[PDB]
Design a protein around this ligand. Structure first.
Ligand SMILES: *[B]([O])([O])[C]([C]N1[C]=C(C([O])=O)N=N1)[N]C(=O)[C]SC1=NN=C([N])S1
Length: 359
C-alpha cells in the first residue's frame, strides 16, 4: 500500500540508523494514523535463538508502565473507590498517623511528596522493609510544591489503588485494566505459555538480561511488558477514549488532565503533556537531567492548553520505550527496543516521523 510504504520509508530514514549507531539487536516501531495501525519490525528479539522481532514479541516497557498505573488510578477514582484528596493511610492502615499520611494520592502519583527519590534505597526489598520505609518517612520540601520524579512515589500510589480495589496490583492490571483496554498480550507476569515471545534485553556488553523485580513499586513504576500491537491499541484508546466503555473511558480521560506545570511541561497522571504544536526542544527538555533527576518547583494550572500532545519515555536495564500521541492529528507512535538508546534519540526520531507524515 502506498500509505504503508510512505510510513516504512520514514521509519527507515529516522529509526533504522539507530540500530547500527547503538548496536540494538531488535526494534518495533508502530504508527497509528486515522485508526489505521502500521507495524514495522527490525532485527532479533533473541540473538542466541535467532528469533526475529515480530507482532508477538513482548518487550519491557520500563517507566511507560507508569501510564497503566495512572489509568488504573483514574479507573478507581471514577468508580469512587478513591478520591485524589485522600491520603494513603485511609487505605494502607499501618500508615495512618505517620508523616506520609499528610501526602495525598494525587501528589504521590505526580511526584510531589517533597521527599521521595527516583528509587527506593537499595536495602528496601521485602514487603515489611517497604512498609518500614514508608512508616519512617519524614517530609523535606513543602508537600505538593516540588516535583521529583520517583518510582516509590507512584509505587505507593499504585499500592493504594490496588487496596481500594481489593485486588493485588498485578491483578488490577491483568484482570481489569488490560482487558478494558482490549490488550491481549500485556503482562506484569509473563506466563509460561508466552515466554517464547518474551524478548531478551541486552546491556552494553550485549549480554541477555531481563528486568529484576524488586519490591512493591516494580509493578506500578517499571514492571509492565507488552507487544507492539498492544501498545498501538493503548495509543488508540488514548486518541479515541469516546470509543471505549464508560469505566475505562473516564479512566483514560483522567490521565489527560494537566495537574500542574514545570516550565513548558504539564504533568498529567502518568503522561507528560504539552501545548500542541510543541517544539522539538520542548519535548527534549522534558527528559533533561534537571527535570528527570532533580526536584523542580511546580506551578498550578492557570488554564489548561486547549490543544495538547502527550508522551512518555521508559527504560529498563535491557529495553527502551517511547510513546507519543497527538489528539488533534489523530496520530501516535510507539518505539520498543531490546537495548536502551538515549531518550533524546527516541524523541528526535519520533518527532521527525510524525511531522513528515502527510495528512
Ligand atoms: B523510567 O524509565 O523513567 C525509570 C527510570 N529510568 C531508567 C532509565 C535508564 O535506564 O536509562 N531512564 N529512566 N525506569 C526504571 O526505574 C527501571 S528500574 C529497572 N530496570 N531494569 C532492572 N533490572 S530494575
Amino acid at each position: 500500500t502506498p500509505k504503508d510504504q510512505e510510513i516504512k520509508k520514514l521509519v527507515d530514514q529516522n529509526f533504522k540508523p539507530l540500530l547500527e549507531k547503538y548496536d540494538v539487536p531488535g526494534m518495533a516501531v508502530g504508527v497509528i494514523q486515522n485508526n489505521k495501525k502500521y507495524e514495522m519490525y527490525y532485527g532479533l528479539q533473541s540473538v542466541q535463538d535467532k528469533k526475529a522481532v515480530n507482532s508477538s514479541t513482548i518487550f519491557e516497557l520500563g517507566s511507560v508502565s507508569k501510564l497503566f498505573t495512572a489509568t488504573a488510578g483514574g479507573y478507581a477514582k471514577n468508580k469512587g473507590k478513591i478520591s485524589f484528596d485522600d491520603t494513603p493511610g485511609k487505605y494502607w492502615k499501618e500508615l495512618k498517623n505517620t508523616p506520609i499520611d499528610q501526602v495525598n494520592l494525587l501528589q504521590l502519583a505526580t511526584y510531589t511528596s517533597g521527599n521521595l527519590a527516583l528509587q527506593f534505597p537499595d536495602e528496601v526489598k521485602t514487603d515489611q522493609q517497604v512498609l518500614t520505609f514508608f512508616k519512617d518517612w519524614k517530609p523535606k520540601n513543602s508537600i505538593g510544591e516540588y516535583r521529583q520524579y520517583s518510582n516509590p512515589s507512584i509505587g505507593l500510589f499504585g499500592k493504594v489503588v490496588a487496596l481500594s480495589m481489593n485486588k493485588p496490583f498485578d491483578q488490577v492490571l491483568e484482570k481489569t485494566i488490560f482487558p478494558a483496554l482490549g490488550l491481549k498480550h500485556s503482562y506484569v507476569n509473563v506466563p509460561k505459555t508466552q515466554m517464547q515471545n518474551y524478548a531478551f534485553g541486552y546491556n552494553q556488553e550485549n549480554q541477555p538480561i531481563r528486568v529484576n523485580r524488586g519490591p512493591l513499586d516494580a509493578a506500578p513504576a517499571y514492571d509492565v511488558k507488552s507487544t507492539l500491537p498492544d501498545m498501538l491499541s493503548f495509543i488508540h484508546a488514548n486518541l479515541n477514549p469516546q470509543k471505549y466503555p464508560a469505566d475505562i473511558q473516564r479512566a483514560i480521560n483522567e490521565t489527560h488532565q494537566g495537574r500542574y506545570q514545570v516550565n513548558t511541561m504539564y504533568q498529567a497522571l502518568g503522561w507528560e503533556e504539552f501545548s500542541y504544536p510543541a517544539t522539538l526542544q520542548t519535548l527534549l527538555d522534558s527528559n533533561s537531567e534537571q527535570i528527570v533527576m532533580k526536584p523542580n518547583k511546580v506551578t498550578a494550572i492557570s488554564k489548561e492548553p486547549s490543544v495538547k500532545m502527550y508522551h512518555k519515555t521508559g527504560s529498563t536495564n535491557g529495553f527502551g520505550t517511547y510513546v507519543v500521541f497527538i489528539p488533534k492529528e489523530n496520530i501516535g507512535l510507539v518505539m520498543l527496543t531490546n537495548k536502551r538508546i538515549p531518550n533524546e534519540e527516541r524523541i528526535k526520531a519520533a518527532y521527525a516521523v510524525l511531522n513528515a507524515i502527510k495528512k
